Design a protein around this motif. Sequence first.
Motif, PDB file in Angstrom:
ATOM      1  N   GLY A  83       0.856  -1.158   0.000  1.00 56.88           N
ATOM      2  CA  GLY A  83       0.000   0.000   0.000  1.00 56.88           C
ATOM      3  C   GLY A  83       0.894   1.209   0.000  1.00 56.88           C
ATOM      4  O   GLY A  83       1.860   1.257   0.763  1.00 56.88           O
ATOM      5  N   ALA A  84       0.614   2.204  -0.833  1.00 60.01           N
ATOM      6  CA  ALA A  84       1.583   3.279  -1.053  1.00 60.01           C
ATOM      7  C   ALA A  84       1.474   4.355   0.027  1.00 60.01           C
ATOM      8  O   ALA A  84       1.510   5.554  -0.232  1.00 60.01           O
ATOM      9  N   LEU A  85       1.347   3.900   1.262  1.00 61.83           N
ATOM     10  CA  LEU A  85       1.128   4.762   2.405  1.00 61.83           C
ATOM     11  C   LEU A  85       2.179   4.533   3.462  1.00 61.83           C
ATOM     12  O   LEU A  85       2.762   5.491   3.975  1.00 61.83           O
ATOM     13  N   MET A  86       2.443   3.279   3.791  1.00 62.77           N
ATOM     14  CA  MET A  86       3.432   2.987   4.805  1.00 62.77           C
ATOM     15  C   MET A  86       4.840   2.918   4.244  1.00 62.77           C
ATOM     16  O   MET A  86       5.769   2.584   4.983  1.00 62.77           O
ATOM     17  N   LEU A  87       5.023   3.225   2.967  1.00 63.73           N
ATOM     18  CA  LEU A  87       6.351   3.334   2.395  1.00 63.73           C
ATOM     19  C   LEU A  87       6.706   4.752   1.986  1.00 63.73           C
ATOM     20  O   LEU A  87       7.566   4.935   1.123  1.00 63.73           O
ATOM     21  N   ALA A  88       6.070   5.761   2.580  1.00 64.94           N
ATOM     22  CA  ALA A  88       6.492   7.148   2.373  1.00 64.94           C
ATOM     23  C   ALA A  88       7.450   7.583   3.481  1.00 64.94           C
ATOM     24  O   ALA A  88       7.374   8.677   4.035  1.00 64.94           O
TER      25      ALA A  88
END
Lengths: 97, 254, 53, 108, 194, 84, 169
Positions: free
Chosen positions: B117-122
Motif C-alpha cells: 500500500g503506497a502509504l506505509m512506504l512514504a
Amino acid sequence: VRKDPITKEWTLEGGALVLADKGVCLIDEFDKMNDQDRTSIHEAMEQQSISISKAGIVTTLQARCSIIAAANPNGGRYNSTLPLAQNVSLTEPILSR
Amino acid sequence: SDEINELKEMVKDEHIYDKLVRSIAPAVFGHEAVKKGILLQMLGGVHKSTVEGIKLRGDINICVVGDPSTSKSQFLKYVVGFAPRSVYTSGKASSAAGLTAAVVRDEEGGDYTIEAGALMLADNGICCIDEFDKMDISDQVAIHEAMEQQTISIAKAGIHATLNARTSILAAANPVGGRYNRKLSLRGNLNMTAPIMSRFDLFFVILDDCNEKIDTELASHIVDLHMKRDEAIEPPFSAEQLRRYIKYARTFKP
Amino acid sequence: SKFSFGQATPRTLLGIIRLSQALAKLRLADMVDIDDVEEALRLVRVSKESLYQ
Amino acid sequence: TGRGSSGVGLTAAVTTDRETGERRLEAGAMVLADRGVVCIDEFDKMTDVDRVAIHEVMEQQTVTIAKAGIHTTLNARCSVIAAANPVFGQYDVNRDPHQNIALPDSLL
Amino acid sequence: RFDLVYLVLDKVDEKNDRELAKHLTNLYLEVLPVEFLTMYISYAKEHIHPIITEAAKTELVRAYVGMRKATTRQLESMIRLAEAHAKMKLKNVVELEDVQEAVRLIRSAIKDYATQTGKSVIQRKLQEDLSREIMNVLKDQASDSMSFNELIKQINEHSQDRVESSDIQEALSRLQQEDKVIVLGEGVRRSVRL
Amino acid sequence: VEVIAYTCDQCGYEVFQEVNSRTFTPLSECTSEECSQNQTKGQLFMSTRASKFSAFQECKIQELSQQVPVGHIPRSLNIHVNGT
Amino acid sequence: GNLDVKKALLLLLVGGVDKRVGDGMKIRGDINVCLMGDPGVAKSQLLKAICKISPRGVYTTGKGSSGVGLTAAVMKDPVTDEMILEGGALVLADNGICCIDEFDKMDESDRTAIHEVMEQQTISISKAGINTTLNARTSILAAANPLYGRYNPRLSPLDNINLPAALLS
C-alpha cells in the motif's frame, strides 16, 4: 479460531481483549462497521467475562477488561439543542453501559 | 571538492528565496502562490517534541483543488521523479487494498501477514494521491486517522499491529461541478466532510479566466517546451545541485 | 419500444443471403433466381412477429 | 432432515484411499432413496448450491458425476415430499397467491 | 486522457444505403500490398526523427486564439498528430501546411458536442431554485421539521423542469455537506436553525 | 517385454530369459560359457533390436445400468490385451 | 403443429462453405438460431432429440462443462502423464451442432463463451500454460427460458434474456 496445519487441530487464538486485561480500545464512528462489532463489545461488559463457541469447543475465558472511547458527533459538538439521542448515532443500551 | 565549496558560496547569496521559487518547474507559468507552498512541502521541518508523551506534527500537508485537465497535473508529474522515493496512486482501488491497509488471506502456511500500500512506504517520501470524491466513506475516516498522529493501527483478524509510518500527504481533488463558484464559499465546493478540512491547512485554490492576452503567452510558453531543442530558459539551479542544497538545508534545528 | 427489435442491419442482410444459398444447396436444381430467394423471405416474415399473437 | 450440505444427491468423491490403491465413489443419499420416499424441509432457508442439485434429479431419474474420477450414470427412483413456509407472515390473501415464496419456478 | 473522439453516423439515408448495398452486391462473385507498406512504416518510425520550425507555430497560435473565441489538453495533442502527418507524407522534415489537416480532424471532433458532467447550463439553474425552496418553509415553520410526504408534494410540481426521483436524492447529499439538513431514514428529517 | 538379450561385447552369447511379472532384475556377467570362466569377463548390457516386444493396453468396464439391482452402485474391473 | 420451426432447422443441418475467399477475408459462416418461450410440452426433448440423431452434434447442459470448461483446459490426471489438455465441447464439436440448454446457468463464464464462438476463430486457452488458438466453425441452437411464470407479452420483451448486445446485432 485459527485453522490447523496438516496434522493439527482447530485451536483457539485470542485477539485484542484477552491480551488487554487493564487497557484501552477505541470505538468512535466506524459508521459502516458499527453494526458489525458493536454486538461483540457491549456483551463484554454486560455479560462480563465473555467467550464463545464458534465451530469448536464451548469454553469461556476470563477478561476483566476496561474500555475507553473517543466518539465523535456528526459535525459540531452542539449539532442541536435537541438531546443526545439526536446527536450521536448510537442507540440507548450500548450507550447505557 | 569544489561542490562542497559550491554550497558555501551559494549559502552566502541574498535573493535565493526568489531564485528558488522561480526555478521550480518549467511546466507551469505564473502563480507564484502555489509555487511557494510546494517548495516548503519538499523540504522537511522539525519533528522533535515534548518529553514523555506526544510526538507532534512532523510537517505540513497542502492540497490544491482546481478544474481538471489544467495546470494541476503538472506538479504531480513534477515531484514523483524529483522527490526522494515518493510514490503516486490514484486511490480508486479503495476496497481491495492499497490506500486502505488490508490483510491478505493465508498463503503457503501463513494467515494474517502484512500488506503493501503506497502509504506505509512514504518514509523520507512525499506520497501523492488524488480524486478524493470518488472513493467510499470508509477510507475517509481511515486516512483521517493517518493524518493526526503519524501511526496507524490495525487488529484485523489476527493480532494487533502498530506501524509508525510517518508521512506527508499532498492531494488534488475535484470541485462539485468543475467550475468554482464565486459568490459562495468553499464550504459547498469542498465536497468533503467538515473535520478533515480543519485537520488540513489551506488549499490555495487555482482559478481560471478566458482572457485574450494570457492565452497567447501561455501558448508561446508551451511551444518552446515541446520543441525538440529550445532550451533557452535558464533555471539558475540544476536538478542535482538543488537536490544537494536542500540536503544541506535539512540538517539544522532552528 | 413496444414490440419490435432490430433496426435493419446489413448483418441481417448478409444472413438472408446465407440461408438462401443454403436452401439453394439442399434443393439444388441449379435455379438460383427470384423464386429461390422468394422462399427465403418467406421464412424471415414468419419467424418475425411470432409475438403479435 | 433437509440439512442441505452438498451430498444430498451426490458423492463428493470420498474414497479414503480404501487400503492404498482403491478409489470409491461412496454413495451419499440416493442409494437409500431408490423405490422409496424422502422428505426435506426449509426450502427458502437454503443456499443456492442445493437447488441446482434438485433441478437435475427431478428432470432426470439419474445423477452422473465425474469429480476427480469416473463418469458413472447410476439410477435412482425417488419421490420428494416438501415443506416450506411463506415469507411475510399472513400476506397470502392481500397479494398474489403466486410468487408467495418466490423460490425459482424451475421446481414449481 | 483521450485526445479526440468520433461517433459514427446513421440515418435512413436512401442514396447511401442503396450504395452500401452495391458494395455487398459485389465481393461475393468470382498498389495494395500486404508486406511492402508494413516494412515501409517500420523503417520509417525510428530512423528519421523530424524537426519543427517557426513556420508551424505562427499559424498554430492563430488557430487557438480564435478557438478560445479544454484549455491545453487539446493543445498538446494537436501538434503530435500534426508532427506524425508531417512524418508520414514527407519522411524528412517539418511541414507548414500539415496543420490544416490537423485542424480538419479536430474540427470534426468538436462537431460531436453541439447538443451535467462538463456542462453547467442545467447546473446554473438547479442549485439556484433548490436554494429557494428551503428559505420559504423555514420562514413559515417555527421548527425544522420536514417530513417525506411534504417534499414530494412540494417540489415535484412547482416546476416540471426537473426529473422526479433521479436527481432529488442526490440533491440533498450536497445539502448534507453544506450545514443545512440531516438524514433520518425514508421519513422525518431535521433542518437548519438560527 | 517377452524376450531378453544381454550382450557383454566379449563373447556375444545373448542370454535369454522368460519374462515374469512387471518387475524383474538383470543378472550378472560371469555366468556364460565363453566370455566367463577366465580372468576377464565381458560386462553385460542390454540390446533393443534383438528383443522382440509385444502390444499392451489397459481398460476398465462398468455395468449397463439396467441390470444393476436397486441397491449399490456398480463397480469396475480390469482387462488386458495381447496378440492383435 | 410448428412446421415453420422444423423447416428453419433442416437448412442449417447442411450448411456448406460460404465462399472460398482465397484472400485474407475470413467471412462469417454458419448462422445460429435461438428460441425462447415456456411451453409445457417439455421443450428439452424437442430440441435435444434432433441433436442425438444429427451428425457430430454434441449434447450439453448448464451444469458440467460451463463457459470456462466449454473450451479445453489443463487438469489433474492419474499417475500417468498429467497436465493433458482436457476439453469441453467446442474443441471437439468443431463444424457441427452445439445444442445448448439452460441459458441462465453459469452465465459468468457462459456469456464470454457465446461471444467467443460467434466471433470467428478465437477458441483458445488464454491461460498461464500456453497461448495457442484453434478453430471455430460450429452453429449454435439456443433455448432461453423466460422469467417467473409466463413471459408477459403485454410487458416489454428482453425481460428474461440478459444479453442485449448478443441478440439484436
